[PDB]
Amino acid sequence: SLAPEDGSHRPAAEPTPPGAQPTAPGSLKAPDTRNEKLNSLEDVRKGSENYALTTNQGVRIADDQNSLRAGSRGPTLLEDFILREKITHFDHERIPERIVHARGSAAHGYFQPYKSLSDITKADFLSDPNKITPVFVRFSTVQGGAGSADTVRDIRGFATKFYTEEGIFDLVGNNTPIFFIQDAHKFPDFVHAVKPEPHWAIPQGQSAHDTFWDYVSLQPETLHNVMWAMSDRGIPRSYRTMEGFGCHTFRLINAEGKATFVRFHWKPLAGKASLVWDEAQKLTGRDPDFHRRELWEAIEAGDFPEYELGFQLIPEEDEFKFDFDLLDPTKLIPEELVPVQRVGKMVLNRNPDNFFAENEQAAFHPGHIVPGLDFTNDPLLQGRLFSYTDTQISRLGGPNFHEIPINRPTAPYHNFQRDGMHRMGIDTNPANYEPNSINDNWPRETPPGPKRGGFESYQERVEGNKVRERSPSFGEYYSHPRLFWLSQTPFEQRHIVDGFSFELSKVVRPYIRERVVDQLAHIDLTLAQAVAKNLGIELTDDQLNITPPPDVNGLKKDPSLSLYAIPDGDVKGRVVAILLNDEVRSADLLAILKALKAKGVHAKLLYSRMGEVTADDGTVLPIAATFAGAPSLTVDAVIVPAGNIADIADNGDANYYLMEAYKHLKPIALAGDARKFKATIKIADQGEEGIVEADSADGSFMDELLTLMAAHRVWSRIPKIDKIPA
Amino acid sequence: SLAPEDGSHRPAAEPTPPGAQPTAPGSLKAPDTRNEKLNSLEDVRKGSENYALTTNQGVRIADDQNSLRAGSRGPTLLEDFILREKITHFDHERIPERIVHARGSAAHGYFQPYKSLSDITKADFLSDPNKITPVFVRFSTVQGGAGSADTVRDIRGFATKFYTEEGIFDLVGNNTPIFFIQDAHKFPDFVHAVKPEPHWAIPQGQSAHDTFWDYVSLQPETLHNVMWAMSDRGIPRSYRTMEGFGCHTFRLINAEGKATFVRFHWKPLAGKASLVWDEAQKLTGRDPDFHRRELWEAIEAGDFPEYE
Amino acid sequence: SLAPEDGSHRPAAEPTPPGAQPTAPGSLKAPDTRNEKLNSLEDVRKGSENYALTTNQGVRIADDQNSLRAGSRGPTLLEDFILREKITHFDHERIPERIVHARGSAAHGYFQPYKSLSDITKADFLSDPNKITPVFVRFSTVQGGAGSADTVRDIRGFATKFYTEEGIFDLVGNNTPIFFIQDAHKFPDFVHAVKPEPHWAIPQGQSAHDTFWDYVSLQPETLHNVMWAMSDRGIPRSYRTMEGFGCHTFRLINAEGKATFVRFHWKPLAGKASLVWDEAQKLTGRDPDFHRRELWEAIEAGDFPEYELGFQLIPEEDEFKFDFDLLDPTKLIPEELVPVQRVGKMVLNRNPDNFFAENEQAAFHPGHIVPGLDFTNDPLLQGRLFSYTDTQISRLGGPNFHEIPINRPTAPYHNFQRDGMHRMGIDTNPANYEPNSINDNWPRETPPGPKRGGFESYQERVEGNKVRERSPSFGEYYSHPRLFWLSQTPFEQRHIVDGFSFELSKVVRPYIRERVVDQLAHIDLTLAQAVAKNLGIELTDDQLNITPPPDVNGLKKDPSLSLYAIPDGDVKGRVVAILLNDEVRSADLLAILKALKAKGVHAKLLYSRMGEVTADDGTVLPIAATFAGAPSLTVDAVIVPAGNIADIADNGDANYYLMEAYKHLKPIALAGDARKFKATIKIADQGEEGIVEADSADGSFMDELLTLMAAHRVWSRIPKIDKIPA
Amino acid sequence: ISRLGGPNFHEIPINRPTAPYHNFQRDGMHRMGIDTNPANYEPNSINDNWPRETPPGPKRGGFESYQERVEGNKVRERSPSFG
């Protein structure tokens, strides 16, 4: 029952490209990668090699294959305490999943600022470009359960736990700059509306159902984040290729006591990229773990996810200077009006060891701030502060959740709190209250000040009556959806139309669809008309005459709202499928792999069976996967080298591979007789932008292919894909 | 008044084919379908129409659109107990999912024997062809979570709760007549091997990964149920078109004290039918709720699932 | 600084007698004490001196006196995360108490065997006289809640966690050798019956109510342990002065595979000693924490509780050699038939740091055995095996209760169990199953063997049908109660009579008293008639004529069953009240204290107020407590030195002090004019045995008093007490 | 939430209101009430928005907080009047 003699059961502890080695726990894959938080977990990491198998009480087990029974065909006996411990632990493995964001994928890393920000914040982690802060980041979807699929259409969560010298700061953000609703009190209504419906618990991972669109049609405040969800922002290529936002106006407080309003951003250094809907939807079935896997493999490969933290800063005196309210979380601050100032870089460079212990039990909460930061009266943020501490009592079993290893501060913590379920810390303090004389009042309060001081709230002025009332300034719902729509490229606009059209077609009650198209007519008539046409709805004369909402402080558009209007592609970490034949032209493959390696682009070698094939020069080529086993959905581009093309020319799966990739706007490159496949995707002899072709793969051929990949997808192909049956 | 005037928001309370009407809670869709268990649940069913919105303490809520704050742009106050009750209940909605068979779809129905089986068993529910026993049945996959997809390749669970006059009898079976392993002490090894692997929690709803096949390779006792799972048995068209089995030899005991060994079977009256792999896998993406949906809509149409 | 300038807030970190210093956490009181288990808890100990006060997230708090509000008289804001974290933790401090034995007191210590027992067991902890095994021991009552009183009449638990090199071994015993019932299926019935009655939840800490005596009257199997409970065994003086027993036959298994039957014993090296009923009852009012306090103070003083472990050993071939069944846990094995072999010594030498973390969270379970031990078919032990694992899932929050620090093995533990609530260990094993090849099958099973082998059950032969049936061999109920009764002294018999009589008088339904009296008539007529007389019940002619049960294997008594038949007194750690006056004779007091010191006996100096008084010769005498404040219930003897007796001669409290101690059979010593107090307890001029008196407090005055203390109480005094109004 | 096991402690019999209670809260450990409402959110059209909010009034109205005037800065400070 043992390891192969050749050692092939164990992954090399060195960076390796995706699929080259089995994946492994981070501490075993990359044992030399360290940071302060990682090292602090060593008290709880448990190895295994050369140790005896035991009960949890440390009793060695002789036979872990059988229950104790009276004769070898007799009843199992109650005194089998080894059986009952083992089965009891198994019977109690699951804990409640997160109410929202249950599906998520996490890694360790570090952050450092580019320069001291002491002029605007006294936060210690932003104070010195050479002070490194460990982080643990979890990316998530929102609606689906922990076992739902990754590449759904949904908002994404992006939560960073900063283990600072002055306490834990959690920046708990999402991949769009707003939310669907204005006041925390409605959160259970909105979440119930988008979640599976209560009678039958359908659908999983999808807003495409009657209750979501019912809520939206009745609550126009939602329309801004709906526009974002219906765009390709709803279906990112990778957690490495989406933006992060902190969602609310918070405050930075400097040593002098000055408050600046701030909104937080994460800029992906790998660039912004998304799937297209047919690809995303099909990929939920071909690999529901695609984003989790891609994140883990990028880190094992050394393509560490990097993000730049950025702040929009608004002086306190400018609070009212926009035509929207700064505290309204359904409103974004356009970068044309307030630029993002670069602040630092975050690098994720190690996977966890055990997903349950580190990912599933991690608790992030936006109320976990540190001196130098503060809140605002954003009425969504305000209610969040209640929820993230409350929910842990059931999810994590009690108030000692900060003692779960992933959650522990690396900064000291000492206070007079005691007891609670599964209390780990054994307090020696004679006193469990203050003020005390019997321990000379330790641990002691600390005055606020420039560094290492106690937390004091910014003394914001409050004047008003106790009311349950929405601010009149929040009562505008259409201008930001319009700004978003107008900032998208024409192909991005088409994809938004198609997203709404697809979703509303699954709404069973036709009046709901009508009411949504009526809302759309208040944003933009062209959008409204294009969705109506797809639903067989005709706009009324009144709907045709609805005045468009006002520009946002004079803006007709803001290109920073588009995924693609300003090129920002980075190919490093992307992946190509190489379709093999049984006699590959080795000269072609040599050139292909050389050019890919030079740009840090990975390759997977595919064939019609597993095992090996041999190239024209005798090189034995191991096969990563079959055409069907690793579909074009999972790669960025497809290359077909020359050789014995007859071997695959008539293979339905190989032909389909190219039809799917073509339909999904991916670059395709065909060398030598591989150009015979031009017939399957109807490319004219003259060729076509987005199809690289030549007698052989070479300098010029790979440069062209790599240029295409830098632009992500071949948007000019869109008119040609209606026709292809794929 | 937000409902449309034409009343098209509300499904007809009569049998209707899949897609014809929105789906609904069973007591609304089919109020006149009753059995002893369904009737006994009436003490806890809560309606809604014509009732005022309240806290859990029965206090009417005037504004369910806003938190209480000091000024309409000011901070939310701690004394907002309506907000806090509502968000507290939300924050604690979830309970642990089942360790296995977390993904499952269920319905109410009834059982009746063809004839008295008193010669072989004194079980009251099998004593009289005119004795009707309410059931509640839950069909499931095995490996994936509660939010995993329906049409994966996996074993299916088929659990029937019989509410008999002499106590609950649960027949907790699967859609193949055997299991992977021989001794319960190995159950956590086997389940850990098939479940998502522990470093990264991949893959969901799939035995197609190293640790499952490593365990199979070292434990040849598994090969029988593996054969079943690799066949199209692993990818049923519908819970209505798969077989059920009680897995073990049990005993029947009659009034005279005689024991007879028994294995239990369910025969689908709709016939046996399965998908093909490419179809099943693609379907987990196009509709991960396909079997849950099909079961609910068959029942709403009158195509009641029947099993012998 | 809040601490006083003179440092009197901090207890001396050295052994001090009870009352001399405030008590402290063990690691602060006795930092130099250590053992392997205490060392291994260091990673979770939290200090406090010189640290800042923080949130659990490590954020320094500036003001720990106020909530955050909108103006200093305004409403509290939801954004006050520091308030909600602190109040959240408080709100969830409590965990379920233990179903039974909820009230208990615990200490750390160590165990060492006198010689290797490898000829009879391969248990590692017993294999070498140099092997020292850390322990943690919790003593308890059974019925009352965690906040009930110590000196109730009840069975006591005595549970020892041995942290061995081959696993945790928990020896979960009580202070009597048997239990009330035979089969574990009845445990919830018996426990419900003794516990507070379900309509009104009365009475706490008492079996003196209808449902207990109903159950007993209907289940004569209970009578044996009821005899023990009704004797002074049910009201021990101290956890240090009671016996411990393992309750069941277990097995020892040597390296050759030979099984020997064993029953486990603890012998108190401080000797056997119990209160009397009136004293124990009043003491639950005057100090409901008396045994907890006594234990903690003994350890702080260096009077470490010490116990000798002993084994009764029965060869397998002697299973059926007795008049009773070895597996019947209502039957004791008389030491006259099977002597206790001494095995080793345990010493308890360090208090915990935090009572909740170490005591309340500790989990003991008799299924926790190690290679070299095994179970038997005792049907009470059999069902115990199920309960002690199960109960922790709610009490301690889930299946990772072995990760709570006090419960952790010091031995290695490695296995394939994963997850569960509060999971601390982060497993790096690529495998969570076996057999596996991907980690070369580690951690691996270990064959059984002579040392460091895997656990294998002893291959006992099982033969019979599947039945729910009591063995006919267990159907004898009276001979062991009779042997117990006959083995007691006449004063111990009187106290049994009075225990039944007092308990049955609290039973409201008379027929239940009558039914119990009928049971007693089956044990011993003298016993039965004496209890009947106290209840106004007359035994029938049939009752008068019940043949007594047989002797047990020819024995008509066994003096080891008596607390006092065979003297085993030890005065070290006992306490004397010294009653002061405003002008004490300093030469009496010097002599008193000098002799008490030489025998390790403590003293408390008592007066009518606090502060100090001054001796005839100007010596300043500090007062520990007032007469009312430290009643005679709390001491073992009373001494009144000479001097200004007139000062206290008419003090009600001072007089009553001597009356109460006199009533409770305690030694009393009077010097010089303190002899005037002889009037208040009605002592004749020639004196009486148990009252020491002389012109001055020496020559042989303190030897006399110390001799009386060594015999614990003045049993001869019993006839004279009924005439005293106290 | 720890003492009584979860957020449905109002369904424990002694705690239950005798007044009606209806709302859009769902699930939680040991959930007794089986809701038949097609909607679990408001505003909804699919159940004509029931159960519905009630304006405050002299009898049988919804709860509205007294509109006390609040003026001051966000402070952690004891009122001098308490000293």
Ligand code: HDE
């Ligand atoms: C024969 C049909 C069958 C077999 C052989 C097994 N399962 Fe099932 N199972 C649980 C434990 C368990 C063990 C210990 C073993 C072999 C030792 C089996 N299973 C094999 C469980 C963890 O206790 C379980 C999880 C949730 C629960 O309540 O019990 C469990 C579930 C389960 C279901 C689902 C019932 C439902 O709630 O829908 C079914 C149909 C099976 N098992 C069948 C089954």
Ligand code: HDE
């Ligand atoms: C012989 C010493 C003895 C005996 C015979 C029993 N108890 Fe104890 N007990 C639990 C259950 C249980 C059962 C099922 C039986 C016979 C069927 C006994 N008891 C008799 C328990 C409910 O599982 C218990 C409650 C908390 C816990 O973890 O286990 C339990 C407690 C207990 C203690 C307390 C240990 C401690 O934490 O101090 C002791 C000394 C005993 N039992 C002794 C005992």
Ligand code: HDD
């Ligand atoms: C008042 C309710 C509420 C509101 C209005 C929001 N959240 Fe939230 N959020 C929760 C209440 C909550 C929660 C219920 O407390 C969750 C799930 C359980 C968890 O610990 O927190 C959570 C989880 C959660 C997570 C997952 C963190 C993780 O990986 O564990 C993210 C990323 C966000 N939220 C992001 C957002 C964003 C960008 C919001 C827009 C501003 C937002 N949430 C509003």
Ligand SMILES: [S]
């Ligand atoms: S947000």
Ligand SMILES: [S]
């Ligand atoms: S089975």
Ligand SMILES: [S]
């Ligand atoms: S016992």
